[PDB]
Swiss-Prot record:
This is Phosphoribosyl isomerase A. It is found in: Cytoplasm. Coiled coil: none annotated. Pfam families: His_biosynth. GO terms for molecular function: 1-(5-phosphoribosyl)-5-[(5-phosphoribosylamino)methylideneamino]imidazole-4-carboxamide isomerase activity; phosphoribosylanthranilate isomerase activity. Its EC number is 5.3.1.16, 5.3.1.24. Keywords: Amino-acid biosynthesis, Aromatic amino acid biosynthesis, Cytoplasm, Histidine biosynthesis, Isomerase, Tryptophan biosynthesis. Involved in both the histidine and tryptophan biosynthetic pathways. It catalyses: 1-(5-phospho-beta-D-ribosyl)-5-[(5-phospho-beta-D-ribosylamino)methylideneamino]imidazole-4-carboxamide = 5-[(5-phospho-1-deoxy-D-ribulos-1-ylimino)methylamino]-1-(5-phospho-beta-D-ribosyl)imidazole-4-carboxamide; N-(5-phospho-beta-D-ribosyl)anthranilate = 1-(2-carboxyphenylamino)-1-deoxy-D-ribulose 5-phosphate. Pathway: Amino-acid biosynthesis; L-histidine biosynthesis; L-histidine from 5-phospho-alpha-D-ribose 1-diphosphate: step 4/9; Amino-acid biosynthesis; L-tryptophan biosynthesis; L-tryptophan from chorismate: step 3/5.
Length: 240
C-alpha cells in the first residue's frame, strides 16, 4: 500500500510556476500547466496536485485552464486554492477534478466547511497549515485556532481527508515533520496527505514510514525541480 505521490502544479496567470535549481542557482521558472501535468502523468503520477495560486489570493481564477488540465489528464486531480464559498466550490468541482482542498475556509467559515464536507464527502479534503510556537500547535493561512481542537471538530464533522503542512519558520529544515504528521494521523480516522518539507528522496522515504499510520500521500513541489531526483525515481523510492 505505497505512499501516493502528488506532484504539484502551481498556477499563476494561467501558467505553471516553479522555483527551480539551475546550474547557476535558483530562479523562478514558468511553463504550461498542461505540459507540467502531462509530464508528471507520463513520469507515472496517478495524482496531480493542482493549485490555483491566483484564486488562493483572489487575484484571479484560472478556471478554464484548470478544466483543460483535468480534462486532458487520464489520471486524477486534487484541486486547491481559494475554495472558500458555494460559488468557488462549485467552480472547482466544475473543473471535473477528483477532489478539492479547502484551507483557510476551515479557520474562517467552520459552518460552511462542515456543510460542504457533509455534502461532498470524499470530494473535499481540508488543508491544515500548522505553525509551532513554543510547543503549541496553531493553525493559520493567508490567529486561526488550536490544531488539535480544529482537527477534532473536523474529524467529528466527517472530514474525509487532511492535507498537513508544517509552516513553522525553518521547521522543515532537517526534513519533514514526522511528529506532526504522526500527531495528526493518530487523532483522526481520515487519511493524511503530507505537504512541504520535501527536498530529497530520503524525505519521501521518511514520510513513507508513516503509511501504516494513516499518511496516505505526499504532495511534491519544488523538490521535483531541484535537479536532485525525478518523479519516476521518487515513485520507485516509495513503492519499495
Amino acid at each position: 500500500m505505497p505512499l501516493i505521490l502528488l506532484p504539484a502544479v502551481n498556477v499563476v496567470e494561467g501558467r505553471a510556476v516553479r522555483l527551480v535549481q539551475g546550474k547557476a542557482g535558483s530562479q523562478t521558472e514558468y511553463g504550461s500547466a498542461v505540459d507540467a501535468a502531462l509530464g508528471w502523468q507520463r513520469d507515472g503520477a496517478e495524482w496531480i496536485h493542482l493549485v490555483d495560486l491566483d484564486a488562493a489570493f483572489g487575484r484571479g481564477s484560472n478556471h478554464e485552464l484548470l478544466a483543460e488540465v483535468v480534462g486532458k489528464l487520464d489520471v486524477q486531480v486534487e484541486l486547491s486554492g481559494g475554495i472558500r464559498d458555494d460559488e468557488s466550490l462549485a467552480a472547482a468541482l466544475a473543473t471535473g477534478c477528483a477532489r478539492v482542498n479547502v484551507g483557510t475556509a476551515a479557520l474562517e467559515n467552520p459552518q460552511w466547511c462542515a456543510r460542504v464536507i457533509g455534502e461532498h464527502g470524499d470530494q473535499v479534503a481540508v488543508g491544515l497549515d500548522v505553525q509551532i510556537i513554543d510547543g503549541e500547535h496553531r493553525l493559520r493561512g493567508r490567529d486561526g485556532g488550536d490544531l488539535w481542537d480544529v482537527l477534532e471538530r473536523l474529524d467529528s464533522e466527517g472530514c474525509s481527508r487532511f492535507v498537513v503542512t508544517d509552516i513553522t519558520k525553518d521547521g522543515t529544515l532537517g526534513g519533514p515533520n514526522l511528529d506532526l504528521l504522526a500527531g495528526v494521523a493518530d487523532r483522526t480516522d481520515a487519511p493524511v496527505i503530507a505537504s512541504g518539507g520535501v527536498s530529497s528522496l530520503d524525505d519521501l522515504r521518511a514520510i513513507a514510514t508513516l503509511t501504516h499510520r494513516g499518511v496516505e500521500g505526499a504532495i511534491v513541489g519544488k523538490a521535483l525541480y531541484a535537479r536532485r531526483f525525478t518523479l519516476p525515481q521518487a515513485l520507485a523510492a516509495v513503492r519499495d
